Amino acid sequence: MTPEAAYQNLLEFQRETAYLASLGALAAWDQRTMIPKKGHEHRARQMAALARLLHQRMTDPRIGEWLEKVEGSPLVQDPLSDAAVNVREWRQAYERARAIPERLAVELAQAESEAESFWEEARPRDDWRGFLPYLKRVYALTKEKAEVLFALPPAPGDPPYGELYDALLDGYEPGMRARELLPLFAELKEGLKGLLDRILGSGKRPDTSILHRPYPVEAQRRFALELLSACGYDLEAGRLDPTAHPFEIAIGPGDVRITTRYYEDFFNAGIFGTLHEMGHALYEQGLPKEHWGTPRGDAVSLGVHESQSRTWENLVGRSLGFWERFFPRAREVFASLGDVSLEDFHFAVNAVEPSLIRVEADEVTYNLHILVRLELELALFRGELSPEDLPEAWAEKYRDHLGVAPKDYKDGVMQDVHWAGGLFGYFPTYTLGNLYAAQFFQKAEAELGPLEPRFARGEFQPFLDWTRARIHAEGSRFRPRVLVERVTGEAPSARPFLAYLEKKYAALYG
Amino acid sequence: MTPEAAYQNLLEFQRETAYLASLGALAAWDQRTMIPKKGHEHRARQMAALARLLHQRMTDPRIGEWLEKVEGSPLVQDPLSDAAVNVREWRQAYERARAIPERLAVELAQAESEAESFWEEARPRDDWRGFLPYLKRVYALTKEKAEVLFALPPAPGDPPYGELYDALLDGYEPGMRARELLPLFAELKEGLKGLLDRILGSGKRPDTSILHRPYPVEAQRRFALELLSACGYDLEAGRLDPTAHPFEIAIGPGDVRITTRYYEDFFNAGIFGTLHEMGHALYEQGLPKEHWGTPRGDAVSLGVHESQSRTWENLVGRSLGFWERFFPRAREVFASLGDVSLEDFHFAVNAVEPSLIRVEADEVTYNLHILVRLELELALFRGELSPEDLPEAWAEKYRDHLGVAPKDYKDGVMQDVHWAGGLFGYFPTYTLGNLYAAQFFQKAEAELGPLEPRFARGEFQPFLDWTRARIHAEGSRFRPRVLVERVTGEAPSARPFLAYLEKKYAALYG
Ligand SMILES: [Zn+2]
Ligand SMILES: [Zn+2]
């Protein structure tokens, strides 16, 4: 068996797994939108059976045989080639899937399910004491999983793991290590606190009460569809439906779906949430279809994915140019806007406020919430902090980073599901997406010409085409750090994000 | 390995296949309702990958090992026991799936796909000449499949095959043979022609033009939902959505879905079509959930399934009692009914008319369309008729059975897709469903008391509970012929259907 024959067998087998898994993607979409109230228990059973099948296919020893025969062949010598890109990822997933003992996968999966469902009810009850045993168990098995993965050799071509955490972080953000995040976030922290301090001393507005007037849900839907169409989302290849928790989900080429949630009495949630999910969807629709089902045709990381959602939510969607374009229409469709000026509205949708809850934070304060979760997760995995001491260390860092501290557990350390779901090394990606987005955006402006005037006329397609040629077309060919450097000429940095904020908020807050 | 251990292994393996297949059911639902216009090609690829997986699981040699160890064991000696019912079906599907050579399955699947897509365009063009080669090929491979299946021993406990056709018919209608259909349909034919002849000589009405006034689509939807709720469809366990071609589809316990099609200018299609699909759904919702995924928990045949759709479309839905109940509401919601009396409306929805097109036929003429297709299919498989001579033999039997003959191919021998899709031995089930339905209905009235008065007050739940205890609860425990006899005390017969028609139409047509 030549390396070419083995590469074909491996591509066919891996592509078939992706097709079967995408029926899982469809069922997950349906579970959150169309499913009958009484159909959930069966759906879970269906998902569980699919998961067993995929676990068999992802650990089939044939994958090792074929990989053994392809690796070191000429076919893969060029790291930039499709085959090298694919095999690099296939090897790394195979090795990680085979290295976890079933005993450990099963206990971890069970502990995360128990802690998630206990957390649903315990957060409204402010019940740390009863939640902690569940979180303690999830941490432990997560830590045990980290050690297993750490002891594997990293993928050929990437920075080695520096410490335990990196083995978790690498799953969500290939190639990203703590020793790169440290300087990145230190620079961001200093710049955000200085900018917050200047906003706090401004004595200017914003009139957020404008956003809490009435905004009929059905008019929000119609207005969001106009926005989706003008920005370039292909509605013939997607759809928009209501859900309890907005998400985007890619079913396959020609089928990328958005969901959102509207609030009769809050403009932001449904409009900017639709735009945020549109950004994700635009990435998925711009990936190269001839590589669907392979690593060359998959999104490269959560950071880059979040860079595309945040590009369209904030850098476009919350910009002066965007609203110069669409504010007249909004006054036509929303009675609560009849007596509202463009300047008031643009300032209102960009209000800044230190607050306890991350998922409600403005773009200036949001990333400080991520820093504290990062700082705590590193303390945990470095063995310097214990889950029992998490509530005090949480408020300590909320006071130093944001200048406000929780008075309870509900709106404090228990506010997010992530840790109960065993999502450690996940949070930094939210911030990486913001830093990447501004860095991409700055190069796009430098190559395309300033974009505010173009947005004001509704011309979004050149910037969209630019993100396709620079980012979406590449799939997983380049690790994020390398992709950022190929598009922008420099390694990931916080300065473009800070420059973007400093200019935008120097103008709004005088 | 005991027989008990083998039966458990076999139940676990077979139930898991059903769960994976039900993700196929979900994707098929989505393909006809929610899928984006550009997502079809991927969906087909997903369906194709699922089909390969299922084909592997359905022919896994382990099924033969486990069956070998269970068969002849005490566990299965009682033919009425769950294990016997299950193993009977598992063996028969395994043997039929293993007996078809891949060469033959692949050519047949290909020939049916080619002939279906060629038939879509060729029927509007009246293009027999170009369609015939495609149909000729599908017949041949279908005939070859019949011979393979015929040469297997029939399932222990059922009538032997009498001739080639029975091997096809048995797949759609377990245990049903041509030599039972012959007397059944001969009796039906004589009775329908006599009743048609009396209707034709009546000189009474019906005013069908009432049904072609306007009926706003959205009011049809709201009215159908009232009907669904009153008849006992569990909307918390289902849903109703528009589609191009109505169907029902069961995804799992708690999740049984209906689709329908409304016409602004034709009342019947969307209302009675919703009721027809509701009948299917009511069967699926009444199957016993603790046996989901096994033959004991599956619908037993297309005839019985169609008996439940036709029960609710016609025996309930087109009855005087039903409209005594719901006609006032219909006059409240439909302006075109303001000047219309109950007597006019009930006669209109029950109009009878010999016509060329089966899918538009009234309940008195519809089954004669099935007889001719049966007569032609038997001629083909007995080697007495050739596909080339099908257009003449078609019009000959349309003249003798219905007294009207097609003038072209479009609205003649090419009107239905079935033969191009290789659905031979399928059509008789439509009529078996009508005969069963009336036979069930007659026993229900004899045990429950006349139902017209109960319908007139909206009391549908006792009859629904009766169909659950008599039919739905049984799953596939009894072959249809045996199930009809356990519920009604007699073997399937045409007389209850004819008695039902004779009384209903003696009154409408004087
Ligand atoms: Zn996001
Ligand atoms: Zn039907």
Tab-separated table of C-alpha atoms in Angstrom, chain A residues 16 19-20 22-24 26-27 29-30 33-39 42-43 45-50 52-53 234-239 251-257 292, chain B residues 16 19-20 22-24 26-27 29-30 33-39 42-43 45-50 52-53 234-239 251-257 292:
chain	number	residue	atom	x	y	z
A	16	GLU	CA	-17.696	9.514	6.026
A	19	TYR	CA	-21.207	13.090	7.201
A	20	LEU	CA	-22.546	10.838	9.980
A	22	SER	CA	-23.430	16.123	10.641
A	23	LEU	CA	-26.720	14.249	11.196
A	24	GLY	CA	-25.846	14.884	14.797
A	26	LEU	CA	-28.969	18.520	12.401
A	27	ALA	CA	-30.511	16.838	15.430
A	29	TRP	CA	-30.308	22.216	15.720
A	30	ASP	CA	-33.732	20.605	15.787
A	33	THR	CA	-35.774	24.923	17.576
A	34	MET	CA	-38.471	22.532	16.214
A	35	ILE	CA	-38.547	19.562	18.582
A	36	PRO	CA	-41.811	18.815	20.392
A	37	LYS	CA	-41.943	19.355	24.105
A	38	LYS	CA	-42.255	15.601	24.682
A	39	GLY	CA	-39.465	14.526	22.281
A	42	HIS	CA	-35.738	10.258	22.778
A	43	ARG	CA	-33.478	12.897	21.269
A	45	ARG	CA	-31.000	8.660	23.380
A	46	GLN	CA	-30.455	9.288	19.671
A	47	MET	CA	-27.519	11.611	20.437
A	48	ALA	CA	-26.001	9.016	22.803
A	49	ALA	CA	-26.163	6.305	20.138
A	50	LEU	CA	-24.582	8.590	17.563
A	52	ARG	CA	-20.930	5.729	20.566
A	53	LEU	CA	-20.717	5.220	16.786
A	234	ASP	CA	-26.947	33.716	2.204
A	235	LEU	CA	-30.499	33.069	3.326
A	236	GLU	CA	-30.936	30.578	0.487
A	237	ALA	CA	-28.260	28.600	2.360
A	238	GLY	CA	-29.485	29.158	5.863
A	239	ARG	CA	-32.323	30.214	8.007
A	251	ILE	CA	-24.986	21.365	8.924
A	252	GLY	CA	-23.054	21.190	5.652
A	253	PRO	CA	-22.335	23.103	2.468
A	254	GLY	CA	-25.437	25.070	1.566
A	255	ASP	CA	-26.930	24.676	5.055
A	256	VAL	CA	-25.699	27.007	7.829
A	257	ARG	CA	-28.322	28.019	10.400
A	292	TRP	CA	-15.849	19.760	3.554
B	16	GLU	CA	-29.264	0.714	18.510
B	19	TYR	CA	-31.934	4.868	17.058
B	20	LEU	CA	-29.345	5.558	14.334
B	22	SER	CA	-34.278	7.549	13.413
B	23	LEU	CA	-31.706	10.321	12.826
B	24	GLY	CA	-32.393	9.451	9.233
B	26	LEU	CA	-35.330	13.397	11.357
B	27	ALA	CA	-33.245	14.399	8.352
B	29	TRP	CA	-38.522	15.367	7.836
B	30	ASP	CA	-36.193	18.348	7.719
B	33	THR	CA	-39.888	21.207	5.674
B	34	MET	CA	-37.010	23.372	7.044
B	35	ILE	CA	-34.015	22.691	4.806
B	36	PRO	CA	-32.504	25.630	2.918
B	37	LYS	CA	-32.871	25.715	-0.818
B	38	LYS	CA	-29.124	25.171	-1.241
B	39	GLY	CA	-28.775	22.320	1.301
B	42	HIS	CA	-25.421	17.730	1.121
B	43	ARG	CA	-28.545	16.172	2.592
B	45	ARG	CA	-24.888	12.735	0.755
B	46	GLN	CA	-25.750	12.504	4.450
B	47	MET	CA	-28.636	10.118	3.687
B	48	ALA	CA	-26.359	7.967	1.490
B	49	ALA	CA	-23.774	7.646	4.264
B	50	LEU	CA	-26.440	6.718	6.791
B	52	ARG	CA	-24.353	2.401	4.044
B	53	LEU	CA	-24.036	2.247	7.848
B	234	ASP	CA	-50.945	15.203	20.946
B	235	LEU	CA	-49.491	18.475	19.729
B	236	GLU	CA	-47.066	18.478	22.658
B	237	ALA	CA	-45.663	15.355	20.967
B	238	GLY	CA	-45.813	16.518	17.403
B	239	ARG	CA	-46.141	19.422	15.117
B	251	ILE	CA	-39.104	10.291	14.844
B	252	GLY	CA	-39.474	8.511	18.186
B	253	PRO	CA	-41.609	8.369	21.306
B	254	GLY	CA	-42.873	11.863	22.013
B	255	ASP	CA	-42.037	13.080	18.494
B	256	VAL	CA	-44.485	12.270	15.665
B	257	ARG	CA	-44.802	14.936	12.963
B	292	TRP	CA	-39.744	1.267	20.594
